[PDB]
Amino acid sequence: KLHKEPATLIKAIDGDTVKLMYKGQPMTFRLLLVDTPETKHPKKGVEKYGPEASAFTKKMVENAKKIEVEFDKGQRTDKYGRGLAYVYADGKMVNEALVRQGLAKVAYVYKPNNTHEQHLRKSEAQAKKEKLNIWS
């Protein structure tokens, strides 16, 4: 059973990355199960819709009253020390909202961190069916 925990926004860094204050400790977070276009891509730099996915996440977490993070069943941090989780802005999961707006694809899943994979896959299909942003 997964549970939500309190977190405080420090700074939005990219469409898939946000810096939060978790349990008194400043910490970078990578949004689970999603690949959004990047502005900080190591090789390409700024991709299409990259700036859009970036502003979307920024506003959403910046205009929220409550921010909560939800870890999955597997590893809680990736090899870069980033926290791996589902982020919620006033009850709405940022991961799903990005995918629903066609501003991100469902990343390659690595068990056992796939609890919401089904949920996200449906939203991506709906977004594709609507040809939103990335899908147009």
Of 30, 52, 68, 100, which one is the catalytic site residue? 30
Q: Which residues contact 15 (CB under 8 A, 6 or more apart)?
A: 36, 37, 38, 39, 50, 53, 54, 56, 57, 98, 103, 104
Does the annotation list 72 as a binding residue? no
> Exposed e or buried b for every residue in 115-127, given b needs 16+ CB within 10 A?
bbbeebeebbeeb
Q: Does 100 qualify as catalytic in the annotation?
A: no
- The dihedral of CA 117, 121, 127, 131: what is its sign? positive
Q: What angle do CA 22, 27, 33 make, to 5 degrees?
A: 95
Of 38, 68, 96, 124, which one is the catalytic site residue? 38
Place of tokens 């989780």: 85
CATH topology of domain 1-136: OB fold (Dihydrolipoamide Acetyltransferase, E2P) (2.40.50)
Of 47, 62, 82, 117, which one is the catalytic site residue? 82
Place of tokens 């977490």: 61
Method: X-ray
Phi-psi region of 49 (alpha: psi -120 to 50; beta: other; left: phi over 0): left
Residue-by-residue DSSP string for 9-21: EEEE-SSSEEEEE
Pairing of strands 105-106, 5-12: unpaired
Q: Does 76 qualify as catalytic in the annotation?
A: no
Q: Does 30 qualify as catalytic in the annotation?
A: yes
Return the domain boundaries, the chain. Answer: 1-136
Give kind and range of the element (H or E) at residue 25.
strand 25-31
Resolution given for this structure, in angstroms: 2.5
